[PDB]
Subunit: 225 residues, 4 copies
Amino acid sequence: SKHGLTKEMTMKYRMEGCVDGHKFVITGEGIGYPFKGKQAINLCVVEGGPLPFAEDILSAAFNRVFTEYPQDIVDYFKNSCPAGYTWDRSFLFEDGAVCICNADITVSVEENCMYHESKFYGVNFPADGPVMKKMTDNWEPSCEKIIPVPKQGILKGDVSMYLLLKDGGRLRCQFDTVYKAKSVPRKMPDWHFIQHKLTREDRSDAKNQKWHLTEHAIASGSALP
Amino acid sequence: SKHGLTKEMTMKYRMEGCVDGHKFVITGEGIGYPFKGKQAINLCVVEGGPLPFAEDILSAAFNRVFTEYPQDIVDYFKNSCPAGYTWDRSFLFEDGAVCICNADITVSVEENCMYHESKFYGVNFPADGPVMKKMTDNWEPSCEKIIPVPKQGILKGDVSMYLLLKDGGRLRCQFDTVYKAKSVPRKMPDWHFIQHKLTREDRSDAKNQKWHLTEHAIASGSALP
Amino acid sequence: SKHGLTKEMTMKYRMEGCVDGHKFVITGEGIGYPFKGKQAINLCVVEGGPLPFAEDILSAAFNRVFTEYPQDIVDYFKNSCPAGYTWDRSFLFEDGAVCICNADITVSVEENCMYHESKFYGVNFPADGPVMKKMTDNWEPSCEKIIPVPKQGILKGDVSMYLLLKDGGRLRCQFDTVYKAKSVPRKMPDWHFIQHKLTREDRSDAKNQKWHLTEHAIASGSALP
Amino acid sequence: SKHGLTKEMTMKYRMEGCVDGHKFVITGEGIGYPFKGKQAINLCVVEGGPLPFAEDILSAAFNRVFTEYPQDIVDYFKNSCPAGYTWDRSFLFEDGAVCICNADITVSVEENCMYHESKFYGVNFPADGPVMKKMTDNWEPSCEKIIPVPKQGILKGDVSMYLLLKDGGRLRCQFDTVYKAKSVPRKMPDWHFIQHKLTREDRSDAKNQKWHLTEHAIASGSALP
């Protein structure tokens, strides 16, 4: 219980959202390894299923506590535990679609469990584009830049994301994030990178829309001396 | 009761929202003149007041039924009444802030009353910018382009907005809107312009954050023969 | 010779440019009516023809002297004559392509002739998009907002343009312009609109790529009292 | 003379350009180490000096031949030598300024020398922003994503750049690049990253505006297995 965290934890999720008028509620449960930056989770659509849009748009909405940090970069995210942190992100897709997500991350030390409460809102997905036609095929691995805002004790993230398409295409999406510990820390990192790789697998059956998501993320500094 | 509408109507509002973690609920009541494109309303912050951000960001979120349409342009908005229409908009401010709003417009013919239910979400307003410092001073009058999407029986709006600043500055914001009648009409307009002018006046006292908003809007076609 | 201008003038053009590595020089001659805001011109590709891209991208590059101004809005452009004005514009297409153009406008009072020297540079047009496939079909009429920068005695223009496609599509392009009289005037307009309508007709034969362009433009203030 | 390249080479530059009406010509000479991804060069303003804008805007305009590639990623850039490659880039600054640059890279094997010919065009830098006030302080190290376009045998680059400000600020700039070998190769890389670090030092005296630039760049694949 280094910040209320252990090497292997469980996770619970609740998301509420609305994309172009369609409302939904998703719940999920998972297992993660904070110090390795690995998590695996299972989502279940509990109201508003089947979703009219690609599951993939929600991937990055479903916790930077799961990042591998080297000893020599301040870990803002684990340092905020157990009370945790919140974040707010915009998604700017290349075809005009725009999303906002918010989450609240909190630890129950007694249950050894991370709690995740999020809101997802999206507008203006083209009726005929690959999101609404469900023709996407996962996000490409990425490199996010994390930038301290020292007067405020918050972080920004900047990542140019590429949603891969079933037909061999790619659809660009610009992510801009604000990360806020519930207590603004005296101890802040320098700017650094976080690299991410996701997987996603639909496991839907006749009763429920369900899928399985994975992330592996590792922090680092610049490769140049 | 041309589409359930009269020359002078009353209006009720409820908005729920969240801007950078701060949640709020606003209610409002007003009087409008659908055929002149004029409305005047009074808002009252009912949870989460005082707001930490400029009232002005919510102005365009608080009904295209109030637009003056010439006989010779199809009025998509009045034609959708009484059941009404919904819209979804993104706000892209020049300093990185991003908002989404949604509203649902409906007529009660018996009460001669327009009902307005909206959601407003905003992220990434700079702590030190004029929105969070409440240094704005109304939107400049504008010209919006309205564009039919004929295969879908919906409209898009495109307007480059300028929020005027107390210090003499201007802050650009890009509005992209989707307008959707609850029944997709066979009768659709050609592309046209809608010009808008707003006013806003804080009328806050010690019990409640309150203000007064006005819009005057007129549709037209291109000035060139 | 109100500012060296007459009711009917002739015009000469020279453009040099480079779009994704392809260099070109175009010359042109035309007739215009400054006080009616009308001009008609003929372009001839003189080096680098046939062009690999749609003629339409160059339309707005080929003089705000040809705008109809009401008595009650300062005419920055005619006021700058005969020495004239320069402008610098960015074109941001929705598919990632980016252009810059520059022009220099000057009057020869003895010849009753407007001289136009421009540079056009474009990058990153998709090999398979409608510009490089020459599947465009003129720009839609528009409304440009003109905004004074009073400390500097220059103007900005902001117009969201739509290039119409042969297949019934539309391709958005964002125009941001800086307009600079060669002497910064004491007399400046308030913000206003300029509406534009263009036509274009290829008149290419076996010796030369040639086409005919027209603009009709009219300034106005807000429609709302 | 692996592709006409040696471990240590010399470099010559000529740039012509125009930023908001101000024309310039810069020449330069340098020493580089293609296999280590290191170069050091000296620029001299030869027409239009002193420049009215920050030297820093031209840094990335002044050769991906100087990148360290691991054996296991195809080196598109060295593979294009000696004939070389060209590139076209847009710069989208957060305050509205827009630049385009083009370069042509070629090797003289007899002289053991890389030749660099470039064009730089910029519009709409705010008169009062840090570029025109010359208040910038170098670019932050970055990570560029390099993406193959297989049907075309070209590469794209995508990097979100941050120009550091003397006052402790940062000014964002979005770089989108197209890289084109003069012969489209059968052998293409997979997507990868290139990390960059620059330095810049003014060495201006009374006769000439002069400065010294350095780059160190290294290619890599994703950190996640």
